[PDB]
Design a protein around this ligand. Structure first.
Ligand code: CA
Ligand code: CA
Ligand code: CA
Ligand code: CA
Lengths: 12, 91, 91, 12
């Protein structure tokens, strides 16, 4: 059970 | 009062990568790329392109001088801290 | 990679005092006063008057709504982090 | 040997 958030959401 | 020991960590993190190479007084996108990839290797942000760095610098290096000051770099942590917190939902 | 364990501490610090009383979603000058006096009791900033809080809120609560968001409160740490770093001179 | 920085410097 491992997932990554979102780099795009952080950029904008 | 964790902010107490945590603040000491942030102050050390500042010199840990900023004085690694180049001008220790200011951070250049190249040094910051190491900061983002060295402290956030695969935990949440993986850096492999300059585009992330270029977009990330416009967020901090709002001067466009291709540089980030201690105050500007400190804000990057807040942005990631704010995004990391979103990971936690109601459950 | 201390920023890793330190970031976890900052995320916990956010809920440690923000959800202590009032609206956990936003911080009001009264809750922030506890944050500044509870995490920085006598280490560097001693709060005994609302004037420090009022001046400190204009620095974060740049909205004047008498409130500070997680992003605005996170910046307060940077300002103190920047001032604390000045404590260290060339020697 | 203990001293405090300055709240005024931080306010402005
Ligand atoms: Ca540097
Ligand atoms: Ca800049
Ligand atoms: Ca709150
Ligand atoms: Ca505000």
């Amino acid at each position: 059970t491992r997932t990554k958030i979102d780099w795009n959401k952080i950029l904008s | 009062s964790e902010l107490e020991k945590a603040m000491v960590a942030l102050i050390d993190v500042f010199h840990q990568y900023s004085g690694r190479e180049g001008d220790k007084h200011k951070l250049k996108k190249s040094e910051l790329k190491e900061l983002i990839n060295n402290e956030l290797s695969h935990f949440l942000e993986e850096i492999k392109e300059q585009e992330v760095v270029d977009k990330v610098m416009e967020t901090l290096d709002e001067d466009g001088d291709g540089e980030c000051d201690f105050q500007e770099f400190m804000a990057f942590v807040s942005m990631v801290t704010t995004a990391c917190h979103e990971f936690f939902e109601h459950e």
